[PDB]
A paper describes a structure:
The crystal structure of the type I IL-4 cytokine–receptor complex extracellular domains has been determined, revealing that the membrane-proximal domains of the receptor ECDs form a “stem region” of intimate receptor–receptor contact. We wished to isolate monovalent antibodies (which we term “staplers”) that bind to the composite dimer surface formed by the “stem region” of the receptors when complexed with their natural cytokine ligands (i.e. the “product complex”).
To obtain structural evidence that the IL-4 stapler scFv recognizes a composite epitope formed by the conjunction of two receptor subunits, we reformatted the stapler scFv as a Fab fragment and determined the crystal structure of the Super-4/IL-4Rα/γc ternary complex bound to the stapler Fab to 3.1 Å resolution. We also found close agreement between the orientation of the IL-4Rα and γc subunits in the presence of the stapler compared with the natural ternary complex. The IL-4 stapler Fab interface with the receptor subunits is partitioned between the variable domains; whereas the IL-4Rα interface is dominated by contacts with the variable heavy (VH) chain, the γc interface principally comprises contacts with the variable light (VL) chain. For both the VH and VL domains, all three complementarity-determining regions (CDRs) are implicated in receptor interactions. The more extensive Fab interface with IL-4Rα compared with γc rationalizes the weak affinity observed between IL-4 stapler and IL-4Rα alone.
Residue numbers in the entry:
A (entry chain A): 3 to 129
B (entry chain B): 1 to 199
C (entry chain C): 39 to 52, 65 to 85, 90 to 108, 122 to 227
D (entry chain L): 1 to 29, 36 to 57, 65 to 72, 74 to 80, 83 to 109, 114 to 233
E (entry chain H): 1 to 9, 11 to 31, 34 to 59, 61 to 72, 74 to 110, 112 to 229
Write the structure that this text describes.
Amino acid sequence: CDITLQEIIKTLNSLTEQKTLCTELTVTDIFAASKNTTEKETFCRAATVLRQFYSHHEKDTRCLGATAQQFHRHKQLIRFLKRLDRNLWGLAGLNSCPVKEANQSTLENFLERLRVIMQSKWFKCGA
Amino acid sequence: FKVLQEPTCVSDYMSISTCEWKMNGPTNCSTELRLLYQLVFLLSEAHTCIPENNGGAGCVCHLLMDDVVSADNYTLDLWAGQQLLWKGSFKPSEHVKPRAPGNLTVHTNVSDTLLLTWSNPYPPDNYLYNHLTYAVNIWSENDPADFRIYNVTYLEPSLRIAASTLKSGISYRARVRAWAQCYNTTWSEWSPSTKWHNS
Amino acid sequence: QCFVFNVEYMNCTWLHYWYKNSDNDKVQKCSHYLFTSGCQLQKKEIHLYQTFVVQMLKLQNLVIPWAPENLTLHKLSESQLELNWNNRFLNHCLEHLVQYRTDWDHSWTEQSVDYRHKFSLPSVDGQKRYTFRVRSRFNPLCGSAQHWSEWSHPIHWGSN
Amino acid sequence: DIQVTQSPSSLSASVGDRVTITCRASQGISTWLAWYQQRPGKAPKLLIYAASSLETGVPSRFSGSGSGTDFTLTISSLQPEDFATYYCQQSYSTPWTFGQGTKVEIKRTVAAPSVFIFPPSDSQLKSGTASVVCLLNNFYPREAKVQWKVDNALQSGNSQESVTEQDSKDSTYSLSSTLTLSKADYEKHKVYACEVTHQGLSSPVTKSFNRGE
Amino acid sequence: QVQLQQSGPGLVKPSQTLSLTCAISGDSVSSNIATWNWIRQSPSRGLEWLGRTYYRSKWYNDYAVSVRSRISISPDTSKNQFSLQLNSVTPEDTAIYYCARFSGWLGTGDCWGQGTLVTVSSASTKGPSVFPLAPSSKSTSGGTAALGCLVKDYFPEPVTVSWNSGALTSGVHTFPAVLQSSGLYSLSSVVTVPSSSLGTQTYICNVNHKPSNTKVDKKVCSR
Ligand SMILES: *[C@@H]1O[C@H](CO[C@@H]2O[C@@H](C)[C@@H](O)[C@@H](O)[C@@H]2O)[C@@H](O)[C@H](O)[C@H]1NC(C)=O
Ligand SMILES: *[C@@H]1O[C@H](CO)[C@@H](O)[C@H](O)[C@H]1NC(C)=O
Ligand SMILES: *[C@@H]1O[C@H](CO)[C@@H](O)[C@H](O)[C@H]1NC(C)=O
Ligand SMILES: *[C@@H]1O[C@H](CO)[C@@H](O)[C@H](O)[C@H]1NC(C)=O
Ligand SMILES: *[C@@H]1O[C@H](CO)[C@@H](O)[C@H](O)[C@H]1NC(C)=O
Ligand SMILES: *[C@@H]1O[C@H](CO)[C@@H](O)[C@H](O)[C@H]1NC(C)=O
């Protein structure tokens, strides 16, 4: 298998535990409209959805916090989202993967559904 | 100018990478050479490193990594003035050299054992946190022949040695290095030493 | 209150179930009631990583494996002492917890072990009696279970 | 200098018995004591280190105990291969000092010696020397009596005996008395005899040969 | 796994210098977790520790008081060896010498060399004489036949007697050497074999006397 698959899972386990203010926003649920695509197409699309999020909401003043710990969480979330983007992108290997029309999903449910797929891939990835 | 041996790099998998290379003839690294490095990715920015002389024809460059994941791949470009000398790639996850442990302390709580504890050098946010196995090195100040290396293969950073395997009245020194089997890393540098004189 | 046991069967205590948003979305029947204490499912009626609804819950966070078996001990070096064991479920999914003490100790001391690592004591007092026991947890690469398995049958080492 | 005294010098025990060897140090050395085994013709082998810890590959019937100045090596269920000499050694400080040794002899049932006798070869006779060899094989105990008969005459001060170390499988011995004569004294006689007197023999056995048969 | 090979046994004239070497395989002489020792054994001395050399951040040497005025142990990091030297030897220095790898911190000999017998004598070396032993005339008790070889008149010890290039080990009995009146040593090596293979199976005793570079291989036929 890969060490990369473990870094991805270790990040999702930390994300689904610690949720913030802008984790309630919506993104494109590429899993609900997965018309039986290959495994690498799902990785490439999962990275683009995450990439489009922290690019849109890193400097989003609404996503910042009032307290210092609330500011730490937002910077910590964006940091973890960048780690998933780069690990999911290199694991896929696809240059471009057009994200077709699909229904929406909040960021938390996109990550929780993503963590389930990753833990399942690692389950079958047992030597 | 010519490149003798090719630049080899190591990473601490957190913030700093380091690259070394030997040159054809003696060179002032800071004056003649520049090393450009950039992460191969959609969102990334190029960085420039000024080499430091390590010897006569040996240059060393410290690289700056905001964050490192296993898939990250960097492009290295070694420039002398306006003419390229060497070009290469570097995947930090494949050349990890962990940071040394610290906060090494000796506990004489138990009378039957001697407890040694140190600090895991990486924060829990780092991928290497749950993969570092250590190796504790104890030696006698009085008997140089007493030079032991204990292998810690569990996740916790501690060591319990039997108090009967130490001698009464002599002072020992300890130091610990770390490595990550999961990433097939080299050894960390030895931590600074601690001293105790048990009776 | 369902619980999966080493990817074999389920035990729920206090009906019909279906897989949410996936294939085979038909409500079934509890083939084997428990006395009405609860229900139980076979190994074929268990699809991990599928949104399991009866009350909805995730299955990979509810797995409790069997206690390890075949605990061995042999000196890896002049001072080392490695402890081995076997697990029923997939060895690449389990997080083991090793616990040991001496007959003079008034409390157990414990150390955690990865799936890829093997536990070993770097220093052992040869004139003391040791006792080891290991329990495992389905965590965290294949699931997020918080419950361990039972303690394995203890093993011993040494004299005096 | 840490001195070490080991006891006893030797002891005989049967297969299955519980053998105990002791070692007393000159000063307190905590648990820094090692035990070695030296089988015949072989270098010493480490059995126990740090007073009580078995070296890998050493059978579980070897035990070491003690702390301070009095230590003990214990063999439960003694085995024929455990025949050797056992040394202790303090490991506290240099110079390393060893015990005087302890010869562990195996005690078995009485065995009878198969008696053989060999005539001098023609290749040896060219050198003007004849060495007749009488061979006792696989007997117990070690005590035996060999007498040479050169034409029904008992010689003396003309032979040499060589006993083997106790065998490490059947715990038996073997002996060879070699009668050496000049080529003239040998040719001046015909029938040589070797008379053995062992406890395992009801009557003395005498193997003989005639010169030129 | 570690393996220690020592130099050959031999003779040393009195007041001359004894020198032995130890070839290390599977470990480094400059290992900082081990120490490399020399031990001798003899009736008048017992198991006597001579000294050691070991490397930590530099080379260290430690000797016993009984030999400190005459001893020198040196490492050889190019051939991965270490050697022992005793000068002004007396007959009391006649013994079996071992090299051994002691563990550094608990001072215990993990691995030992086979051992080398050094004799201190004014006498000179003499090769042996290998004579066969007739198998069947007044022997062959029961179904097992007993034959052997007679290694006679050599100096000094030892002699290495093997059978069929080391393939025959069962029933072999090599007797301890006997110090004859003439001053030379002599031993015997008998071996019991099935009588049904006397004419078929050929039997060779491989006598080897290293102090004289003697290597004899006498055949034993039925006579
Ligand atoms: C490298 O050079 C530094 C500054 O020297 C300057 O650069 C050279 C090329 C000349 O133009 C000279 O006139 C300049 O002052 C030194 O401070 C430094 O020690 C040098 N290092 C080495 C390793 O040569
Ligand atoms: C990094 O990328 C470059 C070009 O994109 C490629 O040539 C090189 O092989 C890559 N490095 C690794 C370790 O794959
Ligand atoms: C050093 O370690 C001890 C326990 O091992 C811990 O209580 C202490 O806070 C640590 N110190 C630092 C500065 O991390
Ligand atoms: C520790 O591990 C190294 C290999 O990583 C091995 O060479 C060494 O012998 C080990 N030491 C002990 C005391 O087990
Ligand atoms: C680990 O890395 C070393 C170089 O540091 C290399 O020689 C070795 O083959 C690697 N092992 C594996 C299993 O990749
Ligand atoms: C599950 O329930 C059955 C019947 O109630 C019982 O026999 C079995 O022991 C239970 N399993 C566990 C692991 O407790």
